[PDB]
Ligand binder design. Structure first.
Ligand SMILES: Cc1cc2nc3c(=O)[nH]c(=O)nc-3n(C[C@H](O)[C@H](O)[C@H](O)COP(=O)(O)OP(=O)(O)OC[C@H]3O[C@@H](n4cnc5c(N)ncnc54)[C@H](O)[C@@H]3O)c2cc1C
Ligand SMILES: Cc1cc2nc3c(=O)[nH]c(=O)nc-3n(C[C@H](O)[C@H](O)[C@H](O)COP(=O)(O)OP(=O)(O)OC[C@H]3O[C@@H](n4cnc5c(N)ncnc54)[C@H](O)[C@@H]3O)c2cc1C
Ligand SMILES: O=C(COc1ccc(F)cc1)N1CCCC1
Lengths: 588, 587
């Protein structure tokens, strides 16, 4: 066990020093490496349980059993006297830079996972390249470094959500004694977009600065893996060339899908276009029912828009369906219209977009309901949110041998390894994993540490908490109620639940029994909490801390013995007592 | 073991049925008691792993070893045939109402703890009385049923905090594209107070409705315990009388202190007066530095007031002092003035309060700094927040034998029992316990279940989380950093920390490096989390869920393996890495 870890660590590390914290000879070598600006990993044997056994295994590579020992790309370089000899004779820089490959690591994709992986690898001396290119949308929209979340995802959508939440803050302020009149206040779309885009631009710049300051080579170029160690790159002038790397990380993400109907690509838009749109969308149709669809519909309605959502079957497929229906009922009561059990057949253009005067066009949408009946209505903007997909055929030559699944995602081991030994995949293209930004960041950073610093820790993909930022937010961690009943049977499942009213909603005359929470528990396992669900303000702040407790195996008794913080929404979880089986009402 | 539990349970339960879920004779007795509207506890022997032993122990009381067995106030009443005989002969009602005392339980004090205890006891058949009386403040302020939190504490102060937070929401809205002009908008104090008091009135009414619907006797009267089972009551006509009870729960809470200086009682006010005050305080001095002092100074400044806080020594004594200083620095940067190392000597009246035109008076405050230099300034309102105290001399005759500590609070065992066997104390008057509303509620409910339903669960008072609702909020769970170092030594403590910026603050152009969080950990115990601290928006919502993990013994490794929710403030706890020992900047 120890021997195999040491072999794998020595072969893979770029520059690694085996050391002890108490040894002055180690301190002397550390100081030389820092002065020469040579970055490296360090393994302190006097701080590992089995450091005595490791010291003996090292002799299989160096034929010495003492410390310090320095290695470069799998080769023993020397002890203290020898390293200092190389430094004195100006031979050290040459030794640490010799490599079979141009780079120790090439990352294809400059988004959530890829930037995290590349920065972390460079910290241990890995010579690293990060490649990023943004293929424009059909109407030509493009953006800078940072990936989907930064440019056209979590960041702009939550900022637009906050703009929508502030409409209710304006209404509430009157009841708390402020002299404004909400009815004579309006919203300016382009002022909001300008501010959102200025924040995104600071993140684009910050990432380029971060990469430069970690000695990472940033190439704004499209990458394609043509053999296990060769990446073909194409730059902004269509100049083609080839770079080589020891380890490869695929981190190229996904893009929005369009339905195969006339007029969709020509006249509709997606979330890729919405967040920098130079005109207010006007009267808008959202086609789809994912969290992207509902989040976007919700803030457009809160900003004063006329919004309709076209739903093929159900809302939020894959989420707890009691909770999804409560989310949708709140939206319908607060201005969002729904065309239920309905799909589109074609989009016709009635007016072209007026780019000079900053106005949308006009469109006729024709479709039909599920029994046979018809749909026909005019809209200024049509947004498609019908799923996302990778296009790895562009990124990856099939002759390399990387196995994909039926959906086109990469099949990986539990340490992110593909079917080709030196190639790994992280983020949204890793098949079967939750498609979330903090998952991609944890996978990338943890992988870099295993490759270049001898770490062993794996990423844990189970019970990852979520939040849907609809006008009333929905946070969750663990199983839906239906999935728990399916897995264990109804007689083994107990559900505790309650409505609640935020104290902030009392003076503001908001609704009594719309916010709601539940704990789905397994009777035969000490009332283990299988899933937690909350519909209410600040649901992501509420949910996050409980995800640590669920990771640790919390039971209902653990929630009961913990005391609440008053007055908060979250404290309601600490005193739940009404079961669904009892039939007693959950209202306040 | 089992036999001592059964004897304690039978002795104090008001009406209790020993039962099995599968027995039709027990169901028949259950159905009779429901039809006669007789409330009772039930213990299902087949749901307990030592139910066999309990069944054998019952025979020491009843001479029988079968179920059902029904007891009333320590006396075996009968099996199935016997209970049904009493029912059809119209004898059962008188049997279940037979008592040595007027009440099974008398609760003195109708606040957070006392209302919770009384309602829960009544659910198991305990015949219960709740007494509540509100002694008026020096200027005459009084209020309704529900205690300090409901009327003059957590509820009105967080509603006024929300009114303050909405001032910054109005400012932020401009940057997110809304057309308003924040500088043209003003605040109306009386409109806010009217809405707050209308909510408080709905709570007063709701508690009276709840006690009526649980068959609890509510007496709006002052109570005094004059022997272990006798409570002297005085009503709103000064009519004095005596009621008796088996068990007594003391739950009378605390009231604000005043300093012993000329003019303090005559011309100043406390938080008891602030939340119903008919005029805006105007230019205000807050004397003190508790969480009550800083919360009130903070929302008054956000509502447009000219506010000064005069601090004897430090802010938030007993809380982590790095966090306390960050809290105070934020308030000073957003318009609260501080007179540091300073105490008041006297308050002089320059104008009487104008009750007609609804205006405060005017006062001259004289004081001094610790080096002897003088303080002298005029204010319209002076609010004292210099601590709170019980006054059990009024509640409790010294000859009853209930022992108090040096501060006048009740010395209790870990099951809330006083030195008098039938008398218990809960809430703020229980010596050594955290003085918080959810603690008082848990202690009262769990105590009622042990007295009247045979429960065994104790309240756990360790690692109870808190939140200070200052303009930037401060949430905490566990030890301060200085307490962790004093208990374990500096070399055994590691602290992980980071600044952060809420996404909501980016477009609004708020501060980059003011929000802050840290985890205080013990190296030799697998990096156990000893304390969690966060300064930022919605800090109580952030902190609550982590209190469950700390209760369960969370380590730094547990925080690391849990994945964040993005974009949130709370997720910053899942990726902390900078240690204070390393000297690396947390920005
Ligand atoms: C509208 C929306 C809202 C979202 N909101 C949230 C939220 O609130 N919370 C959350 O946790 N997640 C959210 N997500 C999901 C989150 O954005 C993704 O899970 C995350 O961005 C995935 O990161 P990644 O590294 O796998 O890919 P990406 O971030 O998509 O980065 C991949 C990058 O590689 C580039 N690339 C592609 N092909 C090549 C090539 N051949 N050569 C070079 N570069 C290439 C791409 O253009 C892109 O820049 C949201 C997503 C969307 C669409
Ligand atoms: C300004 C302020 C803000 C606070 N904010 C919070 C917060 O955000 N969160 C939190 O958890 N806690 C907060 N607290 C603390 C909380 O209010 C108390 O911990 C809680 O009210 C204690 O409950 P209790 O049952 O011990 O007493 P109380 O709620 O004070 O109830 C005791 C009742 O008994 C009455 N009484 C007294 N003597 C007699 C007698 N002889 N006969 C009959 N009745 C009598 C009293 O008048 C009162 O009605 C705050 C306190 C203050 C002052
Ligand atoms: O009363 C308290 C603290 O009380 C204790 C805390 C720890 C302890 F070991 C004992 C008592 N609080 C009221 C406001 C916030 C905290």
């Amino acid at each position: 066990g120890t021997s195999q870890w040491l072999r794998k660590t020595v072969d893979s590390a770029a520059v690694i020093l085996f050391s002890k914290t108490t040894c002055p000879y180690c301190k002397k070598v550390k100081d030389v490496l820092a002065e020469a600006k040579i970055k490296h990993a360090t393994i302190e044997l006097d701080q590992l349980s089995n450091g005595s056994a490791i010291q003996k295994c090292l002799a299989s590579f160096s034929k010495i059993e003492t410390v310090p020992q320095m290695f470069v790309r799998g080769k023993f370089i020397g002890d203290s006297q020898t390293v200092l000899k190389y430094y004195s004779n100006d031979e050290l820089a040459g030794i640490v830079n010799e490599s079979k490959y141009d780079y120790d690591l090439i990352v294809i994709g400059g988004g959530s996972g890829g930037l995290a992986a590349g920065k972390e690898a460079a910290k241990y001396g890995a010579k690293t390249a990060v490649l990023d290119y943004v293929e424009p949308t059909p109407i030509g929209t493009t953006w800078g470094l940072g990936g989907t979340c930064v440019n056209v995802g979590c960041i702009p959508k939550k900022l637009m959500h906050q703009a929508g939440l502030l409409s209710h803050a304006l209404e509430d302020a009157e009841h708390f004694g402020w002299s404004l009149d909400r009815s004579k206040i309006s919203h300016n779309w382009s002022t909001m977009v300008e501010g959102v885009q200025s924040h995104i631009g600071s993140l684009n710049w910050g990432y380029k600065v971060a990469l430069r300051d970690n000695q990472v080579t940033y190439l704004n170029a499209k990458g394609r893996l043509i053999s296990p160690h060769e990446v073909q790159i194409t730059d902004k002038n269509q100049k083609v060339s080839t770079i080589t790397g020891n380890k490869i990380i695929l981190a190229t993400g996904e893009r929005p899908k369009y339905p195969e109907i006339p007029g969709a690509v020509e006249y509709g838009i997606t979330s890729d276009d919405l967040f920098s749109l130079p005109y207010f969308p006007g009267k808008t149709l959202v086609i789809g029912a994912s969290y992207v669809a509902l989040e976007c519909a919700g803030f457009l309605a809160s900003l004063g828009g006329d919004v309709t959502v076209m739903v093929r079957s159900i809302l939020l497929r894959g989420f707890d369906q009691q909770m999804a229906e409560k989310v949708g009922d709140y939206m319908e009561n607060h201005g969002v219209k729904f065309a239920k059990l309905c799909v589109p057949d074609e989009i016709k253009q009635l007016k072209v977009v007026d780019t000079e005067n900053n106005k949308p066009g006009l469109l006729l949408v024709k479709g039909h309901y599920t029994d046979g009946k018809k749909f026909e209505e005019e809209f200024e903007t049509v947004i498609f949110a019908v799923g996302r997909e990778p296009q790895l055929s562009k990124v990856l030559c099939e002759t390399v041998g990387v196995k994909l699944d039926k959906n086109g995602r990469v099949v990986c081991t539990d340490d992110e390894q593909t079917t080709v030994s030196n190639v790994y995949a992280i983020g949204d293209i890793n098949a079967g994993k939750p498609q979330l930004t903090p998952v991609a960041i944890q996978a990338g950073r943890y992988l870099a540490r295993r490759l270049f610093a001898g770490a062993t820790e794996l990423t844990d993909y189970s019970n990852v908490a979520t939040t849907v930022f609809t006008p009333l937010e929905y946070g969750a961690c663990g199983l839906s109620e239906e999935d728990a009943i399916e897995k264990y049977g109804d007689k083994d499942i107990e559900v505790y639940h309650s409505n609640f009213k935020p104290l902030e909603w009392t003076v503001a005359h908001r609704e009594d029994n719309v916010c709601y929470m539940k704990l789905v528990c397994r009777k035969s396992d000490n009332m283990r909490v299988l899933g937690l669900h909350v519909l209410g303000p600040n649901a992501g702040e509420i949910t996050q801390g409980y995800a640590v407790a669920i990771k640790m195996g919390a039971t209902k008794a653990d929630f009961d013995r913990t005391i609440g913080i008053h007055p908060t929404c979250s404290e309601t979880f600490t005193t739940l007592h009404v079961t669904k089986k009892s039939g007693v009402s959950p209202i306040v």
